[PDB]
DNA sequence: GCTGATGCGCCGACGGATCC
DNA sequence: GGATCCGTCGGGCGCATCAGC
């Protein structure tokens, strides 16, 4: 094994005390993670700007209790056009961004609703659900296709503020990131070609994993769980969600969090402290 | 309108073999 | 002959569509 996350370090490494609290969860079907009162979790931990995944829900089916949050006033959504009850991302935030925009370069023609980019005064903030391999790794060439295209988009971005990158990356990139390496290298999730391609992700754009970054020999810490075969309760998990950042926020880097204790999902939030 | 079946998407438990 | 390797297979949940009434 069980895992219990370190108490929110909320200081920078020069002592500067975070002004900025991010939360990104992949809700696994956003209408029944309100169900499963995930929104009373979110009030709780109050963060100044909401990334969501997997979403499933097109806009006008959004549940009127996300139009009861006062603190998360300015909201982003969007669905894939042909696919709808899957993928789905959110973006719901304390100020105004001064910039959004969707997708990783043709959405306007391949609406595919797996990413949000917002620009704010200091920062350009990413969310991403990138997409599966899938059972048999049917997908796999196409998530190797996309991944290139993605670090490629995302390259451009980092060339101007610094960047958040938070979300679903359907990865654990190394051993240490899911219980059972040694039988799942052939799944997806963990083939060499994901890891590969994360790996790619942090030295061309480049970005670092926050959370390891301060953790960097920290195991048994997932952030998914198979709904199957009692894996959460066994802490059988994968590290399928980060926060990736510009090495220039790494002195505005605070904490980095894995709120572990949450339902509603068969992914928990994550958590981001930054000073800025 | 409402329910429930079906379709689609998205790996860890276990049994047998192998290793010394 | 306990530990490990490795291939096989049984399996939770959400959401869309469909049939039925
Ligand atoms: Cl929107």
Redesign the pocket.
């Known amino acids: 094994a069980l895992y219990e996350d370190p108490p929110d370090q909320k200081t920078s490494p020069s002592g500067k005390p975070a002004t900025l609290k991010i939360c990104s969860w992949n809700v696994?079907?956003?209408?029944?993670?309100i169900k499963?009162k995930g929104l009373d979790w979110v009030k709780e931990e109050a963060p100044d700007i909401l990334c969501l995944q997997e979403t499933?829900?097109?806009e006008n089916?959004l549940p009127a209790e996300l139009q009861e949050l006062p603190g998360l006033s300015h909201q982003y959504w969007s669905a894939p056009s042909d696919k709808?009850?899957?993928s789905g991302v959110g973006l719901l935030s304390r100020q105004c961004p001064l910039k959004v925009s969707y997708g990783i370069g043709d959405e306007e023609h391949d609406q595919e609703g797996r990413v949000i980019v917002a620009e704010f005064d200091s920062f350009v903030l990413v969310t991403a659900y990138v997409?599966?391999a899938?059972?048999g790794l049917v997908?796999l060439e196409y998530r190797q296709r996309w991944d290139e295209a993605f670090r490629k988009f995302l390259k451009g971005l980092a060339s101007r503020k610094p960047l958040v990158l938070c979300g679903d990356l359907n990865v654990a990139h190394e051993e240490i990131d899911?219980?059972?390496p040694?039988?799942?290298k052939k799944?997806?999730?963990f083939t060499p070609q994901e890891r590969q391609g994360f790996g790619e992700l942090l030295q061309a754009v480049p970005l670092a994993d926050s959370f390891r970054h301060l953790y960097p020999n920290t195991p048994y810490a997932y952030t998914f769980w198979?709904?199957?075969?009692?894996?959460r309760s066994?802490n059988?998990?994968?590290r399928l969600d980060y926060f990736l950042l510009s090495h220039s926020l790494l002195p505005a880097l605070c904490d980095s969090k894995i709120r572990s204790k949450a339902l509603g999902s068969d992914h928990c939030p994550i958590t981001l402290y930054l000073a800025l």
């Open positions: 696994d079907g956003l209408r029944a993670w499963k499933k829900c097109s089916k709808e009850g899957y997409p599966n899938g059972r997908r899911l219980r059972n040694k039988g799942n799944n997806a999730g198979t709904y199957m075969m009692n894996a066994k059988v998990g994968w």
